Amino acid sequence: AKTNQTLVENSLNTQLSNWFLLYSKLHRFHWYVKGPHFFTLHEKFEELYDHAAETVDTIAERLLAIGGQPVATVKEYTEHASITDGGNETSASEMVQALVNDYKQISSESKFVIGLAEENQDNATADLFVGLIEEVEKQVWMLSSYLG
Amino acid sequence: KTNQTLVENSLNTQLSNWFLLYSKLHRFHWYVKGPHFFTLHEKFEELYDHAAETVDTIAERLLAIGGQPVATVKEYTEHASITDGGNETSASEMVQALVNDYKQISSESKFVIGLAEENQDNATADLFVGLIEEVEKQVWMLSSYLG
Amino acid sequence: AKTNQTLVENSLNTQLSNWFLLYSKLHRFHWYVKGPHFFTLHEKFEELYDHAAETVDTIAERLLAIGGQPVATVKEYTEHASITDGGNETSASEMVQALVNDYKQISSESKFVIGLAEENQDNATADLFVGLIEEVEKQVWMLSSYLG
Amino acid sequence: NQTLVENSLNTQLSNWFLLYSKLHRFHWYVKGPHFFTLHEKFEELYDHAAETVDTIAERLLAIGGQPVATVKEYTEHASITDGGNETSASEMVQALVNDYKQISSESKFVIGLAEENQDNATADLFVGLIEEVEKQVWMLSSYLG
Amino acid sequence: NQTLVENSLNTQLSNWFLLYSKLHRFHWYVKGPHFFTLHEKFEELYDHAAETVDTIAERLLAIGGQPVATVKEYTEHASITDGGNETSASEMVQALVNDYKQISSESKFVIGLAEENQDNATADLFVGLIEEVEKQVWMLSSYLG
Amino acid sequence: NQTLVENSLNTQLSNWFLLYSKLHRFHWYVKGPHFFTLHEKFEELYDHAAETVDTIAERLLAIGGQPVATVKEYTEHASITDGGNETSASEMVQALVNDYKQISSESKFVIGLAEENQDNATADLFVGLIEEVEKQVWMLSSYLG
Amino acid sequence: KTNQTLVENSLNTQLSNWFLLYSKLHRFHWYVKGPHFFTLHEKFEELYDHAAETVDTIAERLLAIGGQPVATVKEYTEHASITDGGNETSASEMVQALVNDYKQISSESKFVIGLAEENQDNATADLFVGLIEEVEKQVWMLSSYLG
Amino acid sequence: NQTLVENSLNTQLSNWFLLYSKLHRFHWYVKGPHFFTLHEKFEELYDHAAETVDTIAERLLAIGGQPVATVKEYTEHASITDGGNETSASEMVQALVNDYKQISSESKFVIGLAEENQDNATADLFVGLIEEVEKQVWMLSSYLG
Amino acid sequence: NQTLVENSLNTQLSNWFLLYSKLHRFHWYVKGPHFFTLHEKFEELYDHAAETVDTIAERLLAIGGQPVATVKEYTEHASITDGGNETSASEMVQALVNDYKQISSESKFVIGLAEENQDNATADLFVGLIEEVEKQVWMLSSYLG
Amino acid sequence: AKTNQTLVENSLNTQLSNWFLLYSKLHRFHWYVKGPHFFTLHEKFEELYDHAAETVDTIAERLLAIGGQPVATVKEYTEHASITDGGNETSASEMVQALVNDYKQISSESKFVIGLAEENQDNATADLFVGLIEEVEKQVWMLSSYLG
Amino acid sequence: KTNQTLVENSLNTQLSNWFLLYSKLHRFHWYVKGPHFFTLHEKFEELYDHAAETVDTIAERLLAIGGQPVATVKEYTEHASITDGGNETSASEMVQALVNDYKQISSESKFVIGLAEENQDNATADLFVGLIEEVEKQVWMLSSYLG
Amino acid sequence: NQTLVENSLNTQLSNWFLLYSKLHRFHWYVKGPHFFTLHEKFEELYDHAAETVDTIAERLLAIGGQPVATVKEYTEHASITDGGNETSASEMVQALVNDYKQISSESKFVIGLAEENQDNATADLFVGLIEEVEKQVWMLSSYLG
């Protein structure tokens, strides 16, 4: 009950941390992408980081609204995330693949947050993450199509 | 009484709550005073604009499911679980009245989802899920103001 | 003098109450109108209630600006208005007729407020209600034309 | 479970493309004194139908399916038709009511299938749809009232 | 060939100004349960008539002619009238159908004169006008159907 | 009292339609190095005139009157004319000054009639008008200065 | 002295008041401090934008009626019934200065209507009627802030 | 002459609806490193195809004809197909080049029939369509070059 | 027939680029009390010239031709020049009247060649250009009148 | 050093005062311009006063940001400016010439402020006035061209 | 070490400072409380929007001059001269933290101009000149709030 | 000092007009699968080039100079050319890199000249330019990477 609530809050802090580190990674890809798909991917990556920033603010405000305490420092993001903004990507295909890998991991982990939220009778927290899955699975299809 | 009628009746109570809230927010918009006047006068208008949208959305959902929305001030008064009455005078008193009404609206909206779900009405539950998200955000903001 | 002022304030509270109850009635008509003029009248009624809401805020703020105390609860609106949001309208023509009846009553009563305001040397309060008469008499002509 | 979901999306995709078609027929052939209102309303509805076509196809693709994508396949996979012999404004509006009512029952069945397959995002898409279609069923039924 | 074209433009400029006038009369006097639709439609149509007036006059100027520009001249040069005793909604709409059809056939003669004078640009102006009026004729005729 | 008000609105309605006409003549025929400025200013003024035409007619209707609505009636009920033989930019601008000056005196007389008939809303419409016309009289007189 | 000249002269005083008010509002915009800084810094800009519009409207009406608007800072100083000077330091002092000047402007604008009406100039009276409405609204808002 | 024009418009209306369909198939199935560019381009092109469908149908109506308006009729009256086995990006783009070129030459025949019936306005519609499709042909051919 | 059309488009593309250049010279050097009006007008006109350059070139591409695309080629293929010794406002405006009139008559020859090659779409491009330039000729000539 | 700072602050107060008096002058020209260039110059003068108002606010806020105290009364503007809003202009050419004269004086004086700002190692204050010179020298060229 | 490398390295420190500032401003946006909640919650978002624009501008300038921007949170932490850490709780504490970081950023940006100028890189200096203008404005506004 | 500044602006003005020209050649002739991206990017760049042309000319005028204003003078005063025989997308992009790199070195030299003549505003204009060109050099070099 109190444990159910704490499990939900902790899971939101992990996802908040993932989305902040993804916003960071997307800057790295925006800045270092090269080759003849430069214009397309430089722009796409900025669109994606704008969406990541929105998501950061949406998760943190939902956590606050349920009585929790969002993590809010880069050291905390690094300690609580299940992903990293690091990596050794150089080519356009490696960058696009890296994003497919992070968005697939976020989709699976968001499904686990829905289960926790539902177990705590928190339909609004569940609904937030259902909407996220929709958006990230769309981008996995587009990014996977780029690579096909 | 019926699974259907229980859903319709619960939508009429919430329709009534949101209209009475629109009313109370006008009273606060008009009588708020002190050095947070500008901020709160404006915030209360933004909130009543949201309340008016919510009134139309709930009534239109009720119609879509075959019900009959209440649609006079006498009926809103008789069907609501909150009131537009009160003797709030200070900015803090007004903000705290809103926290109380939004908290009530959130708990009852969670009960609506349960009724709707039991009547296999996922679309009605979803409207209330969305309202819970917006109201609990406002509860956080207004409680922060008082903190 | 003080009586002149109190008569003006009381008259504004009656009109504020009328316009709030009209905003309510217009919702009822928006929701329950039927027949082949549904799209036209559903939309028209929303336009009209948007205007009623504006008018509510304009009268209440003028009352405040002259040192008065607007009524601000539905119980007060019901006790101070000269009209009602109630009624037994079912057809599109009955709904449109009901509005012609309320807008004509508001126009006559607003002319009486101009006389009171002028007697108290309150030109700005008079000007508010002159502008209202213009708008409501336009709508009476359009709504009466629908019914002709 | 997964194949049943995919197949159900292709039926609904097909229904929405055939409704887009039927709405053009009514937009073009409506007549009588409610011409202006209904010619415009039918265009609004087909714009919504087109958006719904793209959203369902793109969800199907994101879950690893293959959207049907020819008029022959739509005809074959749909549970409605774009045919009929409606002539008056009321016949046209009543035909829309019937199709939207059918789509809404079928969409509730899709939600159950998706939920049983633990696919909450696919289910959410059909929930939203039901909201919009049942609004239109109320509005169109009210016109006939 | 050139003075024929110029005189033919003056007659059409006159027609469009008189139509602008008639469309105000219908906007103001239309009644009955299609009031909102027709009051608004008649405004949209007069806005189009005023744009057309300015485009004809300015093409006449551009070819070296002298557009008529007083109501006495418009009455004197037009082939339609702004007069009439229309009262019902149907009478007003039927009156517009009549005028627009006369405007189309006469604009086809302007095209032929223009083409005979190797004035493609004037012809093109009127081709576009015919496209617009015949659409309005279909719409208004559909209202009456 | 009421009939005198109605008749006075029909005169002013007529004046404004004939000014709309005269402004098109000046828009089309202005020449010399102030062409661009004045061709554009005359269009702005006729857009305002058209709006004033619709506002006066709709007020007349709201008070239970019957707006005149043909160019023959405008000619007959107006206190100005759309005729004249202005040729230079200054002649055109001076003719506008004269008409706007006349309209403004006549509008003050309308306000007295309306006030005597206890019609404050009709009176308000002409007050607003006077504000706008006297602005234009200052601007046009300054051009001539 | 004349019915006409009395109207023209009263418009020059009000033109001058509104320009000096535009000036004072800049001083407040620039020097306001304390925790209502953001709200008041912004409000004072909105108010000076309105004052600038009002200056142009009054001058253009004066021109339209055949008068000559004053149009230098020396003349504004000499014709105004208010000043842009003052030693206001606190937010409350600045807001109260504005309430005082707006109240004065409203009472004198009512006197203008009377002069204009006596010269059968309804259009000039109407401009001032509209100004009274806007200023008295602001007086309510600013007084509420101090309440 | 008139029934030939009408039948020729039905065939083109059919072609544009089938192209709208094919463009959805390519939007959904395109893959490889030009995905973002082509997915978006194919949407822009289908938006244009839908506008074209409505403009043809409404011109057919305006001349007194009866537009086809079911997918069975479009299949029955069209000269292209929405079928095909395109998989690669190049195959899809080449397929669009083929269809647009067929649409251009056939639209040139519509122009000649229209002109023979003194229907300049219908001809003009198709002249504008040829301008747009041949630009797209150049662009798409350039992609393949 | 086809190589004649292509060469004729190159000459017009060249003319529009050189006009763009000349219009910059006039924008920069115009003086006297019509400065604000003419400085701005000359910018509006060069914006139109740049749009025209791109539309001609892209039509040439669309028909299978090779647009010229260096200033040495524009000088070599044009029938006007961007040179000249215009100093006064009147000289600059008169120079534009001269160029626009030459552009119109030459565009009428392009229309005839295009029509002889059954290229309606190219012809239509130039018909629209003539409409625009002759309006500008009237406006600029009016300035000088 | 402290003297360097005080010289910069005083120079900004003189320019703030110039720009306020120019805003005033531009109203006078907007209201009293006459002749056949009326429409053009009435509009141009309003555009210019809108720019002067912006400049007023920009200089005053820069002065505040460097620790100074902007003058903020018309009496102070009159005492600190190097220009006046007064004058005996009647014709359109005299008005346009008067503005050329003030904008040329402002450009020269702004160059002197750049020298003072640079001597105090204040690059941002210098940059503000470089941007002003660009704009005012553009208008001197246009206004001088009107008169050529 | 080189005139070029000194410029590149100084841009990486400032890039890092602006990203960590974007972070701190989120923490303040989320935890600010008390009666200035609405004003400050909104102000802090406007400031982080500006910080994000600044991050992209500095990184893109560094790239244009042939450098390599740092682009992970570990590197931002190691290269910055400020931190996103802190225990600020009150509105005044948060506003004062911002004044401190903006003042630091302004002084170091002046040092960058000097390095850039010594490497004949006027375009890099100009980017920093513009940042100084915006930051010192904010320092005035935030200090006024505390006054 | 002053004459050296003026002469240097005329060289840079010329460079920017010739780059505007070269960007149209590449916009029109680019081919291969990066067609859509590069056809659009080249148009964005020529819009920027046109704005840069007007800004440099207007600065030159404000300092009392005389901008060159014919294609013959641009050819003669420029340090680059709009000629060349680029054919592939990479050749086109590499040619842009070379021109932007050259413009940027030359603009730094202009800044020194302007500073030595105590002209900080002219110097500022070239600083801003360097910022924008070096951005494009990074983006274009990255495409080639």
PDB file of C-alpha atoms in Angstrom, chain C residues 21-148:
ATOM      1  CA  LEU C  21     -28.825  32.752 -16.189  1.00  0.00           C
ATOM      2  CA  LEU C  22     -28.843  33.398 -19.958  1.00  0.00           C
ATOM      3  CA  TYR C  23     -25.341  31.761 -20.208  1.00  0.00           C
ATOM      4  CA  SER C  24     -26.878  28.734 -18.394  1.00  0.00           C
ATOM      5  CA  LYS C  25     -30.003  28.613 -20.679  1.00  0.00           C
ATOM      6  CA  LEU C  26     -27.796  28.783 -23.738  1.00  0.00           C
ATOM      7  CA  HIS C  27     -26.001  25.628 -22.587  1.00  0.00           C
ATOM      8  CA  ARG C  28     -29.328  23.818 -22.247  1.00  0.00           C
ATOM      9  CA  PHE C  29     -30.299  24.867 -25.802  1.00  0.00           C
ATOM     10  CA  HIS C  30     -26.785  23.952 -27.122  1.00  0.00           C
ATOM     11  CA  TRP C  31     -27.134  20.448 -25.656  1.00  0.00           C
ATOM     12  CA  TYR C  32     -30.769  19.638 -26.446  1.00  0.00           C
ATOM     13  CA  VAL C  33     -31.493  21.326 -29.836  1.00  0.00           C
ATOM     14  CA  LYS C  34     -32.561  18.790 -32.515  1.00  0.00           C
ATOM     15  CA  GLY C  35     -33.812  18.601 -36.037  1.00  0.00           C
ATOM     16  CA  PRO C  36     -32.242  19.552 -39.359  1.00  0.00           C
ATOM     17  CA  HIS C  37     -31.057  22.963 -38.091  1.00  0.00           C
ATOM     18  CA  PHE C  38     -28.993  21.143 -35.394  1.00  0.00           C
ATOM     19  CA  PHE C  39     -25.519  22.110 -36.738  1.00  0.00           C
ATOM     20  CA  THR C  40     -26.370  25.744 -37.283  1.00  0.00           C
ATOM     21  CA  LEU C  41     -28.121  26.287 -33.936  1.00  0.00           C
ATOM     22  CA  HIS C  42     -25.706  24.136 -31.813  1.00  0.00           C
ATOM     23  CA  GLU C  43     -22.932  26.425 -33.063  1.00  0.00           C
ATOM     24  CA  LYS C  44     -24.911  29.682 -32.841  1.00  0.00           C
ATOM     25  CA  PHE C  45     -25.872  28.947 -29.210  1.00  0.00           C
ATOM     26  CA  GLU C  46     -22.192  28.456 -28.229  1.00  0.00           C
ATOM     27  CA  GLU C  47     -21.277  31.773 -29.891  1.00  0.00           C
ATOM     28  CA  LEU C  48     -24.014  33.419 -27.876  1.00  0.00           C
ATOM     29  CA  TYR C  49     -22.947  31.891 -24.573  1.00  0.00           C
ATOM     30  CA  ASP C  50     -19.361  33.000 -25.194  1.00  0.00           C
ATOM     31  CA  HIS C  51     -20.768  36.535 -25.556  1.00  0.00           C
ATOM     32  CA  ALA C  52     -22.910  36.145 -22.412  1.00  0.00           C
ATOM     33  CA  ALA C  53     -19.787  35.119 -20.392  1.00  0.00           C
ATOM     34  CA  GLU C  54     -17.928  38.207 -21.597  1.00  0.00           C
ATOM     35  CA  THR C  55     -20.865  40.365 -20.629  1.00  0.00           C
ATOM     36  CA  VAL C  56     -21.022  38.745 -17.153  1.00  0.00           C
ATOM     37  CA  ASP C  57     -17.385  39.682 -16.564  1.00  0.00           C
ATOM     38  CA  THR C  58     -17.805  43.215 -18.007  1.00  0.00           C
ATOM     39  CA  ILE C  59     -20.829  44.115 -15.788  1.00  0.00           C
ATOM     40  CA  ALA C  60     -19.287  42.681 -12.632  1.00  0.00           C
ATOM     41  CA  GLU C  61     -16.027  44.591 -13.195  1.00  0.00           C
ATOM     42  CA  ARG C  62     -17.914  47.841 -13.874  1.00  0.00           C
ATOM     43  CA  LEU C  63     -19.895  47.322 -10.627  1.00  0.00           C
ATOM     44  CA  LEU C  64     -16.628  46.815  -8.741  1.00  0.00           C
ATOM     45  CA  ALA C  65     -15.074  49.879 -10.365  1.00  0.00           C
ATOM     46  CA  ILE C  66     -17.930  52.116  -9.104  1.00  0.00           C
ATOM     47  CA  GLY C  67     -17.566  50.811  -5.522  1.00  0.00           C
ATOM     48  CA  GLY C  68     -20.271  48.115  -5.547  1.00  0.00           C
ATOM     49  CA  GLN C  69     -20.438  44.437  -4.677  1.00  0.00           C
ATOM     50  CA  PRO C  70     -21.357  42.023  -7.435  1.00  0.00           C
ATOM     51  CA  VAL C  71     -23.477  39.001  -6.584  1.00  0.00           C
ATOM     52  CA  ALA C  72     -21.420  35.877  -7.294  1.00  0.00           C
ATOM     53  CA  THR C  73     -23.380  32.693  -6.424  1.00  0.00           C
ATOM     54  CA  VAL C  74     -26.059  30.857  -8.307  1.00  0.00           C
ATOM     55  CA  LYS C  75     -28.524  31.273  -5.414  1.00  0.00           C
ATOM     56  CA  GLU C  76     -28.000  35.050  -5.597  1.00  0.00           C
ATOM     57  CA  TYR C  77     -28.372  35.043  -9.428  1.00  0.00           C
ATOM     58  CA  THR C  78     -31.706  33.148  -9.060  1.00  0.00           C
ATOM     59  CA  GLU C  79     -32.938  35.685  -6.406  1.00  0.00           C
ATOM     60  CA  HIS C  80     -31.846  38.866  -8.229  1.00  0.00           C
ATOM     61  CA  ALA C  81     -32.656  38.089 -11.924  1.00  0.00           C
ATOM     62  CA  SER C  82     -35.859  39.118 -13.774  1.00  0.00           C
ATOM     63  CA  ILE C  83     -35.488  36.082 -16.070  1.00  0.00           C
ATOM     64  CA  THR C  84     -34.930  32.287 -15.463  1.00  0.00           C
ATOM     65  CA  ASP C  85     -32.760  29.590 -17.048  1.00  0.00           C
ATOM     66  CA  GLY C  86     -35.780  27.211 -16.695  1.00  0.00           C
ATOM     67  CA  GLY C  87     -38.454  26.456 -19.241  1.00  0.00           C
ATOM     68  CA  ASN C  88     -40.145  23.710 -21.239  1.00  0.00           C
ATOM     69  CA  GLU C  89     -38.653  24.234 -24.721  1.00  0.00           C
ATOM     70  CA  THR C  90     -38.261  21.203 -26.977  1.00  0.00           C
ATOM     71  CA  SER C  91     -38.331  22.320 -30.607  1.00  0.00           C
ATOM     72  CA  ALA C  92     -35.770  24.509 -32.406  1.00  0.00           C
ATOM     73  CA  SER C  93     -38.382  27.302 -32.919  1.00  0.00           C
ATOM     74  CA  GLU C  94     -39.352  27.292 -29.227  1.00  0.00           C
ATOM     75  CA  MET C  95     -35.667  27.634 -28.192  1.00  0.00           C
ATOM     76  CA  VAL C  96     -35.082  30.463 -30.671  1.00  0.00           C
ATOM     77  CA  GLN C  97     -38.297  32.197 -29.511  1.00  0.00           C
ATOM     78  CA  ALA C  98     -37.264  31.865 -25.852  1.00  0.00           C
ATOM     79  CA  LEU C  99     -34.028  33.717 -26.633  1.00  0.00           C
ATOM     80  CA  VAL C 100     -35.856  36.479 -28.545  1.00  0.00           C
ATOM     81  CA  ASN C 101     -38.049  36.898 -25.385  1.00  0.00           C
ATOM     82  CA  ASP C 102     -35.064  37.145 -22.983  1.00  0.00           C
ATOM     83  CA  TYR C 103     -32.989  39.477 -25.266  1.00  0.00           C
ATOM     84  CA  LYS C 104     -36.022  41.817 -25.726  1.00  0.00           C
ATOM     85  CA  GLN C 105     -36.544  41.932 -21.921  1.00  0.00           C
ATOM     86  CA  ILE C 106     -32.799  42.627 -21.391  1.00  0.00           C
ATOM     87  CA  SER C 107     -32.894  45.424 -23.974  1.00  0.00           C
ATOM     88  CA  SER C 108     -35.844  47.166 -22.282  1.00  0.00           C
ATOM     89  CA  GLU C 109     -34.300  46.739 -18.815  1.00  0.00           C
ATOM     90  CA  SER C 110     -30.894  48.030 -20.021  1.00  0.00           C
ATOM     91  CA  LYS C 111     -32.639  51.247 -21.230  1.00  0.00           C
ATOM     92  CA  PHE C 112     -33.891  51.737 -17.659  1.00  0.00           C
ATOM     93  CA  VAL C 113     -30.287  51.311 -16.368  1.00  0.00           C
ATOM     94  CA  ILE C 114     -29.123  54.038 -18.776  1.00  0.00           C
ATOM     95  CA  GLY C 115     -31.725  56.409 -17.169  1.00  0.00           C
ATOM     96  CA  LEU C 116     -30.521  55.564 -13.664  1.00  0.00           C
ATOM     97  CA  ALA C 117     -26.854  55.843 -14.560  1.00  0.00           C
ATOM     98  CA  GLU C 118     -27.450  59.266 -16.263  1.00  0.00           C
ATOM     99  CA  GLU C 119     -29.368  60.514 -13.216  1.00  0.00           C
ATOM    100  CA  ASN C 120     -26.280  59.613 -11.106  1.00  0.00           C
ATOM    101  CA  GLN C 121     -23.919  61.358 -13.635  1.00  0.00           C
ATOM    102  CA  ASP C 122     -22.342  57.986 -14.520  1.00  0.00           C
ATOM    103  CA  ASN C 123     -21.708  58.207 -18.267  1.00  0.00           C
ATOM    104  CA  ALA C 124     -19.372  55.192 -18.417  1.00  0.00           C
ATOM    105  CA  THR C 125     -21.944  52.823 -16.853  1.00  0.00           C
ATOM    106  CA  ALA C 126     -24.561  54.189 -19.312  1.00  0.00           C
ATOM    107  CA  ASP C 127     -22.130  53.609 -22.227  1.00  0.00           C
ATOM    108  CA  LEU C 128     -21.676  49.946 -21.274  1.00  0.00           C
ATOM    109  CA  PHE C 129     -25.392  49.310 -21.505  1.00  0.00           C
ATOM    110  CA  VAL C 130     -25.797  51.318 -24.770  1.00  0.00           C
ATOM    111  CA  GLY C 131     -23.283  48.885 -26.348  1.00  0.00           C
ATOM    112  CA  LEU C 132     -25.178  45.927 -24.975  1.00  0.00           C
ATOM    113  CA  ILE C 133     -28.519  47.124 -26.477  1.00  0.00           C
ATOM    114  CA  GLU C 134     -26.833  47.358 -29.902  1.00  0.00           C
ATOM    115  CA  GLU C 135     -25.607  43.769 -29.745  1.00  0.00           C
ATOM    116  CA  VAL C 136     -28.819  42.250 -28.322  1.00  0.00           C
ATOM    117  CA  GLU C 137     -31.115  44.086 -30.719  1.00  0.00           C
ATOM    118  CA  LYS C 138     -28.926  42.754 -33.628  1.00  0.00           C
ATOM    119  CA  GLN C 139     -29.515  39.202 -32.362  1.00  0.00           C
ATOM    120  CA  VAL C 140     -33.243  39.778 -31.873  1.00  0.00           C
ATOM    121  CA  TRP C 141     -33.400  40.804 -35.607  1.00  0.00           C
ATOM    122  CA  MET C 142     -31.463  37.679 -36.711  1.00  0.00           C
ATOM    123  CA  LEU C 143     -33.346  35.266 -34.413  1.00  0.00           C
ATOM    124  CA  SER C 144     -36.760  36.901 -35.376  1.00  0.00           C
ATOM    125  CA  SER C 145     -35.689  36.517 -39.075  1.00  0.00           C
ATOM    126  CA  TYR C 146     -35.019  32.760 -38.497  1.00  0.00           C
ATOM    127  CA  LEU C 147     -38.635  32.505 -37.295  1.00  0.00           C
ATOM    128  CA  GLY C 148     -40.176  34.631 -40.169  1.00  0.00           C
TER     129      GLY C 148
END
